[PDB]
Amino acid sequence: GDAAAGKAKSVMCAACHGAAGVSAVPTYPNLAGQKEAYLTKQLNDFKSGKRNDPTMKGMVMALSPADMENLAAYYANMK
Amino acid sequence: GDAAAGKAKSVMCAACHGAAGVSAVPTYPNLAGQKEAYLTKQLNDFKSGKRNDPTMKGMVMALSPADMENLAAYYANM
Ligand code: HEC
Ligand code: HEC
């Protein structure tokens, strides 16, 4: 959805996925420029438990449907 | 893993993930420049069934552990 709203919500995400969506640790994925619909589905799937990862299930706990779309827009538009 | 061997096993993967690791389709992820260790984990997780996606489970059933490392290195280093 809204890239700017996503930025506002990305401070925690940046600690692991990087300030510009490129991670510095090899087990944390890069998000910069990823497909927006794919990113949204992953966040939806962590929240629902469809994709089991204890760290990310925890990170999406407080995210609304709009928040996940917005975070996806923020990373997808990274160049 | 061995990027060169990976590239040689990548024809099927390229059909959805793109010839240069950037996909054309909104629900298919880009793999280009992704972290090698992360990509390797996901492939192992599709094969073990720990990550559920009917399409990718299918795609990994034929791959050895080395093939999966090799594909990961191929995408990670492009
Ligand atoms: C570490 C403490 C993290 C923080 C903070 C955030 N994420 Fe994360 N993320 C982390 C790990 C270890 C993984 C991989 C899980 C695995 O299967 O090995 C991820 C993965 C994601 C993904 C999936 C990417 C993909 O290519 O499929 C996304 C979309 C993602 N993370 C986004 C994201 C957001 C929006 C965060 C804050 C709200 C966030 N992550 C925090 C580790 C960590
Ligand atoms: C479509 C018909 C595909 C073919 C052929 C291959 N993959 Fe795939 N891939 C596909 C989908 C629909 C998804 C997303 C599943 C989801 O969770 O929505 C994926 C995902 C991957 C991943 C995970 C990437 C991530 O960021 O976590 C990887 C590492 C991957 N695909 C690699 C890969 C390889 C090596 C392939 C052939 C051997 C391959 N894919 C084929 C769809 C399709």
Side-chain angles (χ1 to χ4, degrees), chain B residues 27-52:
Chain B
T27 54
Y28 294 170
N30 308 331
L31 306 179
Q34 190 54 272
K35 294 288 196 292
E36 180 182 351
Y38 173 81
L39 288 175
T40 307
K41 190 169 170 301
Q42 302 316 303
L43 292 174
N44 293 317
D45 286 353
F46 288 129
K47 201 182 182 181
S48 83
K50 189 174 275 83
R51 186 171 164 184
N52 281 315

PDB file of all heavy atoms in Angstrom, chain B residues 27-52:
ATOM      1  N   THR B  27       3.743 -12.757  -7.338  1.00  0.00           N
ATOM      2  CA  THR B  27       3.763 -13.682  -6.212  1.00  0.00           C
ATOM      3  C   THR B  27       4.975 -14.616  -6.203  1.00  0.00           C
ATOM      4  O   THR B  27       5.098 -15.476  -5.317  1.00  0.00           O
ATOM      5  CB  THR B  27       2.503 -14.558  -6.236  1.00  0.00           C
ATOM      6  OG1 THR B  27       2.399 -15.179  -7.522  1.00  0.00           O
ATOM      7  CG2 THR B  27       1.274 -13.712  -5.964  1.00  0.00           C
ATOM      8  N   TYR B  28       5.852 -14.475  -7.195  1.00  0.00           N
ATOM      9  CA  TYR B  28       7.061 -15.279  -7.245  1.00  0.00           C
ATOM     10  C   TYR B  28       8.209 -14.425  -6.815  1.00  0.00           C
ATOM     11  O   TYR B  28       8.471 -13.357  -7.395  1.00  0.00           O
ATOM     12  CB  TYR B  28       7.360 -15.826  -8.646  1.00  0.00           C
ATOM     13  CG  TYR B  28       6.371 -16.817  -9.193  1.00  0.00           C
ATOM     14  CD1 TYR B  28       6.433 -17.211 -10.528  1.00  0.00           C
ATOM     15  CD2 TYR B  28       5.359 -17.340  -8.415  1.00  0.00           C
ATOM     16  CE1 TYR B  28       5.539 -18.119 -11.040  1.00  0.00           C
ATOM     17  CE2 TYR B  28       4.461 -18.259  -8.927  1.00  0.00           C
ATOM     18  CZ  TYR B  28       4.562 -18.644 -10.241  1.00  0.00           C
ATOM     19  OH  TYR B  28       3.665 -19.551 -10.762  1.00  0.00           O
ATOM     20  N   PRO B  29       8.935 -14.881  -5.797  1.00  0.00           N
ATOM     21  CA  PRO B  29      10.000 -14.010  -5.276  1.00  0.00           C
ATOM     22  C   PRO B  29      11.227 -13.928  -6.199  1.00  0.00           C
ATOM     23  O   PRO B  29      11.570 -14.912  -6.896  1.00  0.00           O
ATOM     24  CB  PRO B  29      10.374 -14.698  -3.953  1.00  0.00           C
ATOM     25  CG  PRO B  29      10.036 -16.148  -4.190  1.00  0.00           C
ATOM     26  CD  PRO B  29       8.779 -16.107  -4.999  1.00  0.00           C
ATOM     27  N   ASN B  30      11.877 -12.768  -6.167  1.00  0.00           N
ATOM     28  CA  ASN B  30      13.243 -12.615  -6.650  1.00  0.00           C
ATOM     29  C   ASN B  30      14.225 -13.383  -5.776  1.00  0.00           C
ATOM     30  O   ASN B  30      14.114 -13.385  -4.534  1.00  0.00           O
ATOM     31  CB  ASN B  30      13.662 -11.159  -6.636  1.00  0.00           C
ATOM     32  CG  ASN B  30      12.684 -10.245  -7.351  1.00  0.00           C
ATOM     33  OD1 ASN B  30      11.991 -10.642  -8.291  1.00  0.00           O
ATOM     34  ND2 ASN B  30      12.627  -9.002  -6.898  1.00  0.00           N
ATOM     35  N   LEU B  31      15.210 -13.996  -6.410  1.00  0.00           N
ATOM     36  CA  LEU B  31      16.259 -14.726  -5.691  1.00  0.00           C
ATOM     37  C   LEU B  31      17.619 -14.057  -5.833  1.00  0.00           C
ATOM     38  O   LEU B  31      18.542 -14.347  -5.073  1.00  0.00           O
ATOM     39  CB  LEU B  31      16.348 -16.168  -6.208  1.00  0.00           C
ATOM     40  CG  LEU B  31      15.061 -16.963  -6.189  1.00  0.00           C
ATOM     41  CD1 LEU B  31      15.303 -18.348  -6.743  1.00  0.00           C
ATOM     42  CD2 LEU B  31      14.456 -17.037  -4.781  1.00  0.00           C
ATOM     43  N   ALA B  32      17.737 -13.154  -6.807  1.00  0.00           N
ATOM     44  CA  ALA B  32      19.015 -12.540  -7.130  1.00  0.00           C
ATOM     45  C   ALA B  32      19.650 -11.774  -5.961  1.00  0.00           C
ATOM     46  O   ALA B  32      19.033 -10.925  -5.358  1.00  0.00           O
ATOM     47  CB  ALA B  32      18.870 -11.636  -8.357  1.00  0.00           C
ATOM     48  N   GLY B  33      20.893 -12.121  -5.633  1.00  0.00           N
ATOM     49  CA  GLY B  33      21.638 -11.428  -4.593  1.00  0.00           C
ATOM     50  C   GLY B  33      21.196 -11.736  -3.178  1.00  0.00           C
ATOM     51  O   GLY B  33      21.733 -11.158  -2.251  1.00  0.00           O
ATOM     52  N   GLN B  34      20.220 -12.624  -3.022  1.00  0.00           N
ATOM     53  CA  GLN B  34      19.800 -13.092  -1.712  1.00  0.00           C
ATOM     54  C   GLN B  34      20.960 -13.766  -0.956  1.00  0.00           C
ATOM     55  O   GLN B  34      21.904 -14.241  -1.551  1.00  0.00           O
ATOM     56  CB  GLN B  34      18.591 -14.039  -1.829  1.00  0.00           C
ATOM     57  CG  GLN B  34      17.932 -14.399  -0.524  1.00  0.00           C
ATOM     58  CD  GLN B  34      17.541 -13.155   0.278  1.00  0.00           C
ATOM     59  OE1 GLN B  34      18.343 -12.629   1.051  1.00  0.00           O
ATOM     60  NE2 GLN B  34      16.320 -12.676   0.081  1.00  0.00           N
ATOM     61  N   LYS B  35      20.903 -13.737   0.370  1.00  0.00           N
ATOM     62  CA  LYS B  35      21.918 -14.411   1.199  1.00  0.00           C
ATOM     63  C   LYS B  35      21.969 -15.913   0.937  1.00  0.00           C
ATOM     64  O   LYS B  35      20.926 -16.603   0.963  1.00  0.00           O
ATOM     65  CB  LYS B  35      21.639 -14.154   2.683  1.00  0.00           C
ATOM     66  CG  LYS B  35      21.800 -12.694   3.080  1.00  0.00           C
ATOM     67  CD  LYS B  35      23.274 -12.325   3.089  1.00  0.00           C
ATOM     68  CE  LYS B  35      23.561 -11.027   3.824  1.00  0.00           C
ATOM     69  NZ  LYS B  35      23.006  -9.870   3.110  1.00  0.00           N
ATOM     70  N   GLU B  36      23.178 -16.430   0.706  1.00  0.00           N
ATOM     71  CA  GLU B  36      23.324 -17.830   0.344  1.00  0.00           C
ATOM     72  C   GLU B  36      22.775 -18.747   1.417  1.00  0.00           C
ATOM     73  O   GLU B  36      22.031 -19.673   1.117  1.00  0.00           O
ATOM     74  CB  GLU B  36      24.793 -18.206   0.000  1.00  0.00           C
ATOM     75  CG  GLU B  36      24.900 -19.700  -0.390  1.00  0.00           C
ATOM     76  CD  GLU B  36      26.314 -20.200  -0.714  1.00  0.00           C
ATOM     77  OE1 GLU B  36      27.231 -19.375  -0.816  1.00  0.00           O
ATOM     78  OE2 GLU B  36      26.485 -21.441  -0.864  1.00  0.00           O
ATOM     79  N   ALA B  37      23.103 -18.491   2.672  1.00  0.00           N
ATOM     80  CA  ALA B  37      22.680 -19.381   3.757  1.00  0.00           C
ATOM     81  C   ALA B  37      21.132 -19.401   3.871  1.00  0.00           C
ATOM     82  O   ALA B  37      20.527 -20.443   4.103  1.00  0.00           O
ATOM     83  CB  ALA B  37      23.286 -18.936   5.050  1.00  0.00           C
ATOM     84  N   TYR B  38      20.518 -18.232   3.714  1.00  0.00           N
ATOM     85  CA  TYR B  38      19.075 -18.124   3.780  1.00  0.00           C
ATOM     86  C   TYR B  38      18.415 -18.988   2.677  1.00  0.00           C
ATOM     87  O   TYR B  38      17.482 -19.771   2.941  1.00  0.00           O
ATOM     88  CB  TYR B  38      18.657 -16.651   3.659  1.00  0.00           C
ATOM     89  CG  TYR B  38      17.171 -16.520   3.564  1.00  0.00           C
ATOM     90  CD1 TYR B  38      16.366 -16.574   4.719  1.00  0.00           C
ATOM     91  CD2 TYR B  38      16.541 -16.404   2.307  1.00  0.00           C
ATOM     92  CE1 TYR B  38      14.956 -16.492   4.616  1.00  0.00           C
ATOM     93  CE2 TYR B  38      15.141 -16.322   2.195  1.00  0.00           C
ATOM     94  CZ  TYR B  38      14.349 -16.389   3.347  1.00  0.00           C
ATOM     95  OH  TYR B  38      12.962 -16.326   3.230  1.00  0.00           O
ATOM     96  N   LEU B  39      18.901 -18.852   1.452  1.00  0.00           N
ATOM     97  CA  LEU B  39      18.348 -19.586   0.319  1.00  0.00           C
ATOM     98  C   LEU B  39      18.495 -21.085   0.541  1.00  0.00           C
ATOM     99  O   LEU B  39      17.580 -21.856   0.279  1.00  0.00           O
ATOM    100  CB  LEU B  39      19.052 -19.205  -0.977  1.00  0.00           C
ATOM    101  CG  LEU B  39      18.766 -17.820  -1.567  1.00  0.00           C
ATOM    102  CD1 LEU B  39      19.651 -17.594  -2.772  1.00  0.00           C
ATOM    103  CD2 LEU B  39      17.321 -17.690  -1.945  1.00  0.00           C
ATOM    104  N   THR B  40      19.657 -21.492   1.036  1.00  0.00           N
ATOM    105  CA  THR B  40      19.867 -22.891   1.332  1.00  0.00           C
ATOM    106  C   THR B  40      18.883 -23.408   2.378  1.00  0.00           C
ATOM    107  O   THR B  40      18.305 -24.484   2.219  1.00  0.00           O
ATOM    108  CB  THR B  40      21.296 -23.137   1.802  1.00  0.00           C
ATOM    109  OG1 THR B  40      22.191 -22.591   0.840  1.00  0.00           O
ATOM    110  CG2 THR B  40      21.540 -24.618   1.939  1.00  0.00           C
ATOM    111  N   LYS B  41      18.684 -22.652   3.456  1.00  0.00           N
ATOM    112  CA  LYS B  41      17.694 -23.035   4.450  1.00  0.00           C
ATOM    113  C   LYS B  41      16.305 -23.237   3.835  1.00  0.00           C
ATOM    114  O   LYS B  41      15.666 -24.235   4.132  1.00  0.00           O
ATOM    115  CB  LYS B  41      17.622 -21.990   5.588  1.00  0.00           C
ATOM    116  CG  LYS B  41      16.783 -22.405   6.795  1.00  0.00           C
ATOM    117  CD  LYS B  41      16.983 -21.433   7.968  1.00  0.00           C
ATOM    118  CE  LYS B  41      15.964 -21.681   9.112  1.00  0.00           C
ATOM    119  NZ  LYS B  41      14.530 -21.549   8.659  1.00  0.00           N
ATOM    120  N   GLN B  42      15.853 -22.310   2.985  1.00  0.00           N
ATOM    121  CA  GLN B  42      14.501 -22.383   2.437  1.00  0.00           C
ATOM    122  C   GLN B  42      14.333 -23.638   1.588  1.00  0.00           C
ATOM    123  O   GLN B  42      13.315 -24.317   1.683  1.00  0.00           O
ATOM    124  CB  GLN B  42      14.141 -21.148   1.599  1.00  0.00           C
ATOM    125  CG  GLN B  42      14.236 -19.823   2.318  1.00  0.00           C
ATOM    126  CD  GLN B  42      13.614 -19.896   3.723  1.00  0.00           C
ATOM    127  OE1 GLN B  42      12.438 -20.241   3.888  1.00  0.00           O
ATOM    128  NE2 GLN B  42      14.405 -19.618   4.720  1.00  0.00           N
ATOM    129  N   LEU B  43      15.323 -23.936   0.753  1.00  0.00           N
ATOM    130  CA  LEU B  43      15.264 -25.139  -0.077  1.00  0.00           C
ATOM    131  C   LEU B  43      15.190 -26.413   0.784  1.00  0.00           C
ATOM    132  O   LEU B  43      14.321 -27.275   0.558  1.00  0.00           O
ATOM    133  CB  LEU B  43      16.454 -25.193  -1.049  1.00  0.00           C
ATOM    134  CG  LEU B  43      16.434 -24.122  -2.135  1.00  0.00           C
ATOM    135  CD1 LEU B  43      17.720 -24.156  -2.955  1.00  0.00           C
ATOM    136  CD2 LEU B  43      15.193 -24.252  -3.047  1.00  0.00           C
ATOM    137  N   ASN B  44      16.074 -26.526   1.779  1.00  0.00           N
ATOM    138  CA  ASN B  44      16.011 -27.636   2.744  1.00  0.00           C
ATOM    139  C   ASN B  44      14.655 -27.685   3.402  1.00  0.00           C
ATOM    140  O   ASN B  44      14.123 -28.769   3.602  1.00  0.00           O
ATOM    141  CB  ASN B  44      17.048 -27.502   3.878  1.00  0.00           C
ATOM    142  CG  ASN B  44      18.454 -27.638   3.398  1.00  0.00           C
ATOM    143  OD1 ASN B  44      18.765 -28.501   2.593  1.00  0.00           O
ATOM    144  ND2 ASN B  44      19.328 -26.785   3.908  1.00  0.00           N
ATOM    145  N   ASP B  45      14.106 -26.518   3.752  1.00  0.00           N
ATOM    146  CA  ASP B  45      12.794 -26.451   4.436  1.00  0.00           C
ATOM    147  C   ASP B  45      11.603 -26.836   3.564  1.00  0.00           C
ATOM    148  O   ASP B  45      10.629 -27.409   4.057  1.00  0.00           O
ATOM    149  CB  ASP B  45      12.543 -25.058   5.052  1.00  0.00           C
ATOM    150  CG  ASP B  45      13.395 -24.804   6.337  1.00  0.00           C
ATOM    151  OD1 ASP B  45      14.074 -25.746   6.812  1.00  0.00           O
ATOM    152  OD2 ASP B  45      13.388 -23.659   6.869  1.00  0.00           O
ATOM    153  N   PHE B  46      11.655 -26.517   2.274  1.00  0.00           N
ATOM    154  CA  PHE B  46      10.671 -27.047   1.329  1.00  0.00           C
ATOM    155  C   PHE B  46      10.782 -28.575   1.214  1.00  0.00           C
ATOM    156  O   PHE B  46       9.779 -29.276   1.131  1.00  0.00           O
ATOM    157  CB  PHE B  46      10.885 -26.439  -0.055  1.00  0.00           C
ATOM    158  CG  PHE B  46      10.468 -24.978  -0.171  1.00  0.00           C
ATOM    159  CD1 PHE B  46      11.349 -24.048  -0.693  1.00  0.00           C
ATOM    160  CD2 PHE B  46       9.226 -24.540   0.278  1.00  0.00           C
ATOM    161  CE1 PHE B  46      10.981 -22.712  -0.808  1.00  0.00           C
ATOM    162  CE2 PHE B  46       8.856 -23.202   0.153  1.00  0.00           C
ATOM    163  CZ  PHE B  46       9.748 -22.303  -0.378  1.00  0.00           C
ATOM    164  N   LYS B  47      11.995 -29.102   1.171  1.00  0.00           N
ATOM    165  CA  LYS B  47      12.172 -30.548   0.980  1.00  0.00           C
ATOM    166  C   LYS B  47      11.751 -31.355   2.214  1.00  0.00           C
ATOM    167  O   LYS B  47      11.130 -32.418   2.111  1.00  0.00           O
ATOM    168  CB  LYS B  47      13.606 -30.871   0.604  1.00  0.00           C
ATOM    169  CG  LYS B  47      13.727 -32.225  -0.088  1.00  0.00           C
ATOM    170  CD  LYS B  47      15.156 -32.570  -0.412  1.00  0.00           C
ATOM    171  CE  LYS B  47      15.231 -33.901  -1.157  1.00  0.00           C
ATOM    172  NZ  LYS B  47      16.664 -34.233  -1.449  1.00  0.00           N
ATOM    173  N   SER B  48      12.088 -30.822   3.379  1.00  0.00           N
ATOM    174  CA  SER B  48      11.753 -31.443   4.655  1.00  0.00           C
ATOM    175  C   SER B  48      10.278 -31.254   4.979  1.00  0.00           C
ATOM    176  O   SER B  48       9.746 -31.916   5.864  1.00  0.00           O
ATOM    177  CB  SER B  48      12.579 -30.800   5.776  1.00  0.00           C
ATOM    178  OG  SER B  48      11.969 -29.599   6.232  1.00  0.00           O
ATOM    179  N   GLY B  49       9.632 -30.326   4.277  1.00  0.00           N
ATOM    180  CA  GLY B  49       8.228 -30.036   4.501  1.00  0.00           C
ATOM    181  C   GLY B  49       7.999 -29.070   5.648  1.00  0.00           C
ATOM    182  O   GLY B  49       6.852 -28.760   5.974  1.00  0.00           O
ATOM    183  N   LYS B  50       9.085 -28.592   6.260  1.00  0.00           N
ATOM    184  CA  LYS B  50       8.983 -27.611   7.344  1.00  0.00           C
ATOM    185  C   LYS B  50       8.463 -26.244   6.860  1.00  0.00           C
ATOM    186  O   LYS B  50       7.889 -25.510   7.641  1.00  0.00           O
ATOM    187  CB  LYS B  50      10.328 -27.430   8.052  1.00  0.00           C
ATOM    188  CG  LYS B  50      10.218 -26.582   9.316  1.00  0.00           C
ATOM    189  CD  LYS B  50      11.514 -26.511  10.123  1.00  0.00           C
ATOM    190  CE  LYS B  50      11.683 -27.684  11.093  1.00  0.00           C
ATOM    191  NZ  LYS B  50      12.244 -28.904  10.443  1.00  0.00           N
ATOM    192  N   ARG B  51       8.710 -25.908   5.590  1.00  0.00           N
ATOM    193  CA  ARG B  51       8.041 -24.782   4.922  1.00  0.00           C
ATOM    194  C   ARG B  51       7.051 -25.325   3.883  1.00  0.00           C
ATOM    195  O   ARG B  51       7.429 -26.044   2.946  1.00  0.00           O
ATOM    196  CB  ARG B  51       9.042 -23.813   4.267  1.00  0.00           C
ATOM    197  CG  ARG B  51       8.373 -22.593   3.706  1.00  0.00           C
ATOM    198  CD  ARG B  51       9.324 -21.533   3.259  1.00  0.00           C
ATOM    199  NE  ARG B  51       8.684 -20.538   2.396  1.00  0.00           N
ATOM    200  CZ  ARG B  51       9.308 -19.537   1.792  1.00  0.00           C
ATOM    201  NH1 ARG B  51      10.596 -19.346   1.993  1.00  0.00           N
ATOM    202  NH2 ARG B  51       8.624 -18.695   0.999  1.00  0.00           N
ATOM    203  N   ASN B  52       5.775 -25.012   4.093  1.00  0.00           N
ATOM    204  CA  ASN B  52       4.690 -25.527   3.258  1.00  0.00           C
ATOM    205  C   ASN B  52       4.312 -24.635   2.083  1.00  0.00           C
ATOM    206  O   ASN B  52       3.735 -23.549   2.245  1.00  0.00           O
ATOM    207  CB  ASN B  52       3.445 -25.779   4.105  1.00  0.00           C
ATOM    208  CG  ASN B  52       3.533 -27.066   4.876  1.00  0.00           C
ATOM    209  OD1 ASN B  52       3.926 -28.099   4.333  1.00  0.00           O
ATOM    210  ND2 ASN B  52       3.190 -27.015   6.155  1.00  0.00           N
TER     211      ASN B  52
END
